[PDB]
Design a protein around this ligand. Structure first.
Ligand SMILES: *[C@@H]1O[C@H](CO)[C@@H](O[C@@H]2O[C@H](CO)[C@@H](O[C@H]3O[C@H](CO)[C@@H](O)[C@H](O)[C@@H]3O)[C@H](O)[C@H]2NC(C)=O)[C@H](O)[C@H]1NC(C)=O
Ligand SMILES: *[C@@H]1O[C@H](CO)[C@@H](O[C@@H]2O[C@H](CO)[C@@H](O[C@H]3O[C@H](CO)[C@@H](O)[C@H](O)[C@@H]3O)[C@H](O)[C@H]2NC(C)=O)[C@H](O)[C@H]1NC(C)=O
Ligand SMILES: *[C@@H]1O[C@H](CO)[C@@H](O[C@@H]2O[C@H](CO)[C@@H](O[C@H]3O[C@H](CO)[C@@H](O)[C@H](O)[C@@H]3O)[C@H](O)[C@H]2NC(C)=O)[C@H](O)[C@H]1NC(C)=O
Ligand SMILES: *[C@@H]1O[C@H](CO[C@@H]2O[C@@H](C)[C@@H](O)[C@@H](O)[C@@H]2O)[C@@H](O[C@@H]2O[C@H](CO)[C@@H](O)[C@H](O)[C@H]2NC(C)=O)[C@H](O)[C@H]1NC(C)=O
Ligand SMILES: *[C@@H]1O[C@H](CO)[C@@H](O[C@@H]2O[C@H](CO)[C@@H](O)[C@H](O)[C@H]2NC(C)=O)[C@H](O)[C@H]1NC(C)=O
Ligand SMILES: *[C@@H]1O[C@H](CO)[C@@H](O[C@@H]2O[C@H](CO)[C@@H](O)[C@H](O)[C@H]2NC(C)=O)[C@H](O)[C@H]1NC(C)=O
Ligand code: NAG
Ligand code: NAG
Ligand code: NAG
Ligand code: NAG
Lengths: 40, 240, 312, 47
């Protein structure tokens, strides 16, 4: 059943932000993360 | 924070040891230089429209007044082949230089310091970075603070108390839905809205979206407790 | 941010529709592989340049239906829902403002609707969630509280915003009014983008004029030399045209490789300004516009990006 | 005021220092305490 498909690329997940004139979101917690970056 | 960091270093270690393509930006530079050197040596097999590509086999078949004309072709085509290689090398070397000046700037601003520049030392807010050497390259292990699981809150630009407006010294005013607090922006740690957490400026009529709430004074009880004791002392001094 | 992808088939350019010229050209060896490869390297790095500038978010944030941004009128720079392409009114103005032989233009991977959509995601994130969507998940904040954090960021205490909010919003609305008028008024405003279209057009026009050169052969037309002459008398005449047309491509590909390195350098600057001026607030003096930086809004243009830097 | 400023050293070191008062906001607060404490002593004489 595997075959080559061709499609218009999506740009990512759509995500309507919950904006309001008196609402804020604040993180109750945090993740420390390590990202590698590689340069010639 | 340690257990998160020690896990994230473990994921780097595994990832580099597991997948093929993570070294791509360095392996690409090795492959382009190999491909260009290989291409330069292959051009020596090319005739360039001369009778042969082998210099001694030209000289072993034609006499000098026309063996020179074949050799001049090979000289022209091989000199054109070096010039193509050296132009490719110069243009590439300018790319690698740009990448070395970026890497030097990342060493200076992410390793020798902490950067407030967004994305320049990875996604998140930059804490620090650790350099690691690689073949012809540098790897940076950027360590960042990323805001995790969030909660929504009601908020206000200012608080109204004695008809004066109040604003946070650091952070933001938030309500849990019933009570008001002040918190640092980048981590939920609510505190009582005090005269030490806030500063006054002007009156409540000028600010759009200001809310009424009490502001606590921490010194008021340290004089009112002292007052209730003073009144008790006066009460005792009625007794003699 | 980019320039038009061009592929020039060096065999079809040097030796258009001729077998005899192709069989001579093989004797020059791998140069035609180098020419095709170099222009493919350029054609791929133009999608890369566009991706590093615009794809700085992996989530397509969208405006709220209510527009209660504390009096700041962003309707000139959000998408217009009514147009067949979802671009802003300033992006549509910027799109009006820019104007046989192996040559092929290849289309950019990201169409202008998709560059407008990445620009919309960056801008809708910037209005609704401050810099936070660059650090991680987008965290909402009321726009006047975002401008307050900004004011504290340039070292002006945030009560200066709330006391003056009608004025600060009317000045932002008026300044976007001047951006609208400036771009409608003057021919030269987009010169830095039009200059790139013009250099590519000029370098290709120059490469085509070289097909009309003789290089000391009897004709500039390859078919005439093959029509007029026998095989052995023809070798010498075609080989001139091969040498001169090959050198014309070696020139053009070198000019394009140098020029691509300049567009790359401009794209990496634009990616740095997207990260440090749109996804953040910059302490860097003069980097995010003249003044003290508050925030910036990206807008697309043909092969480019426009930043609207807002400064105190 | 003592909330707008911080203290270091003395008047002899800083080139171009100038005299002005600094308003300590605890002082008039406890002066509102002083005259109330004082009146309560005056009244407390009467019994
Ligand atoms: C919003 O945040 C408030 C502060 O955390 C919270 O109010 C606090 O609620 C706790 C109980 O969850 C109360 O605990 C005390 O209650 C009485 C006091 O006499 C005692 O019987 C208990 O043993 C205990 O000491 C706190 O007194 C109360 N604090 C205040 C300032 O009222 C609210 O409940 C939160 N609101 C929401 C919607 O979650
Ligand atoms: C925030 O708290 C304030 C203090 O409790 C409160 O102020 C009070 O507002 C009412 C309604 O505007 C006023 O009521 C008087 O208004 C006029 C006279 O000016 C008359 O028509 C009315 O009959 C009535 O006398 C109060 O005088 C006023 N009190 C003070 C001390 O200012 C605010 O309304 C509160 N705001 C919110 C949003 O909670
Ligand atoms: C800033 O305020 C200072 C404090 O008031 C003031 O210093 C005072 O200056 C006078 C005049 O020089 C001194 O007067 C005394 O000087 C000597 C003793 O040192 C005597 O011979 C004099 O007769 C007289 O009594 C004060 O002693 C001195 N106060 C102190 C505490 O040293 C500065 O002059 C002021 N400066 C400016 C520019 O406003
Ligand atoms: C924080 O709130 C947003 C949306 O606002 C809330 O909407 C109600 C659910 C109620 O809580 C109101 O008082 C708030 O105004 C949340 O967004 C919703 O997310 C759910 C999935 O979790 C989704 O099904 C809804 O469609 C979203 N609604 C809107 C209007 O966007 C958001 O998830 C909340 N975040 C947290 C961590 O609580
Ligand atoms: C903050 O996030 C961490 C995870 O990153 C939470 O730690 C986990 O807590 C649960 C119990 O609640 C344990 O089962 C996990 O083993 C813990 N993991 C680690 C790495 O310690 C932490 O509890 C969260 N705290 C808050 C207040 O949200
Ligand atoms: C935001 O600014 C725009 C541009 O000035 C306003 O749009 C104009 O509004 C008037 C009155 O409704 C119309 O007659 C014009 O035709 C509109 N022009 C355009 C280009 O659309 C808009 O009304 C403002 N919105 C808010 C909420 O202030
Ligand atoms: C927020 O919007 C509502 C209307 O949906 C309005 O009643 C309210 O007064 C607004 N508040 C602020 C702070 O703008
Ligand atoms: C009351 O005052 C007397 C001195 O006048 C003192 O001995 C006594 O300890 C005081 N008691 C209290 C409760 O203040
Ligand atoms: C500043 O300079 C002037 C001379 O131009 C001098 O008279 C004055 O005393 C100086 N101010 C101070 C505080 O030394
Ligand atoms: C004096 O003290 C009594 C309580 O002992 C109080 O009722 C009265 O108002 C006070 N009078 C004055 C003049 O302070």
């Amino acid at each position: 059943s595997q075959s080559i498909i061709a499609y218009t690329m999506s740009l990512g997940a759509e995500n309507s932000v919950a904006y309001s004139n008196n609402s804020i979101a604040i993180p109750i917690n945090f993740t420390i993360s390590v990202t590698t970056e590689i340069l010639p | 924070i340690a257990n998160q960091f020690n896990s994230a270093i473990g994921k780097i270690q595994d990832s580099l040891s597991s997948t093929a393509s993570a070294l791509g930006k360095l392996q690409d530079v090795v492959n382009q230089n190999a491909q260009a050197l290989n291409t330069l040596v292959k051009q020596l097999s090319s005739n360039f429209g001369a009778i042969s590509s082998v210099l001694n086999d030209i000289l072993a078949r034609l006499d000098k007044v026309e063996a020179e004309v074949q050799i001049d072709r090979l000289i022209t085509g091989r000199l054109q082949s070096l010039q193509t290689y050296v132009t490719q090398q110069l243009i590439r070397a300018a790319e690698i230089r740009a990448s070395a000046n970026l890497a030097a700037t990342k060493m200076s601003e992410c390793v020798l310091g902490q950067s407030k520049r967004v994305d320049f030392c990875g996604k998140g807010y930059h804490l620090m970075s650790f350099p690691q050497s690689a073949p012809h390259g540098v790897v940076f292990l950027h360590v960042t603070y990323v805001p995790a699981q969030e909660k929504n809150f009601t908020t206000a630009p200012a608080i109204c108390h004695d008809g004066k407006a109040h604003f946070p010294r650091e952070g933001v005013f938030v309500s849990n839905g019933t009570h008001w607090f002040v918190t640092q922006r980048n981590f939920y740690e609510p505190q009582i809205i005090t005269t030490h957490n806030t500063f006054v400026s002007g009156n409540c009529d000028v600010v759009i979206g200001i809310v009424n709430n009490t502001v606590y004074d921490p010194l008021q009880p340290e004089l009112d407790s002292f007052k209730e004791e003073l009144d008790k002392y006066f009460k005792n001094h009625t007794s003699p | 941010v980019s320039m038009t992808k061009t592929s020039v088939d060096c065999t079809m350019y040097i030796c258009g529709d001729s077998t005899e010229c192709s069989n001579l050209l093989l004797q020059y060896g791998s140069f035609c592989t180098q020419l095709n490869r170099a222009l493919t390297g350029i054609a791929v790095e133009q999608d890369k340049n566009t991706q590093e500038v615009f794809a700085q978010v992996k989530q397509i944030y969208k405006t709220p239906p209510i527009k209660d941004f504390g009096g700041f009128n962003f309707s000139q720079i959000l998408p217009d829902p009514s147009k067949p392409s979802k671009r802003s009114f300033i992006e549509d103005l910027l799109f009006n403002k820019v104007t046989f032989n192996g040559l092929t233009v290849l289309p950019p991977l990201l169409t202008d609707e998709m560059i407008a959509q990445y620009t919309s995601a960056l801008l809708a994130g910037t209005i609704t969630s401050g810099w936070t969507f660059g650090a991680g998940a987008a965290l909402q904040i009321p726009f006047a509280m975002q401008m307050a954090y900004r004011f504290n960021g340039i070292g002006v205490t945030q009560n200066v915003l709330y006391e003056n909010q009608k004025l600060i919003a009317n000045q932002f609305n008026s300044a976007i009014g001047k951006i609208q008028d400036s771009l409608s008024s003057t021919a030269s405003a987009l010169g830095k983008l039009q200059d790139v279209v013009n250099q590519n057009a000029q370098a290709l026009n120059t490469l085509v004029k070289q097909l009309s050169s003789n290089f000391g052969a009897i004709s500039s037309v390859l078919n005439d030399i093959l029509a007029r002459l026998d095989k052995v008398e023809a070798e010498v005449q075609i080989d001139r045209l091969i040498t001169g047309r090959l050198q014309s491509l070696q020139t053009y590909v070198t000019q394009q490789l140098i020029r691509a390195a300049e567009i790359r350098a401009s794209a990496n600057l634009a990616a740095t300004k997207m990260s440090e001026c749109v996804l953040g607030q910059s302490k860097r003096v003069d980097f995010c516009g003249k003044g003290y930086h508050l925030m910036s809004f990206p807008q697309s243009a043909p092969h480019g990006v426009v930043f609207l830097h807002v400064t105190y």
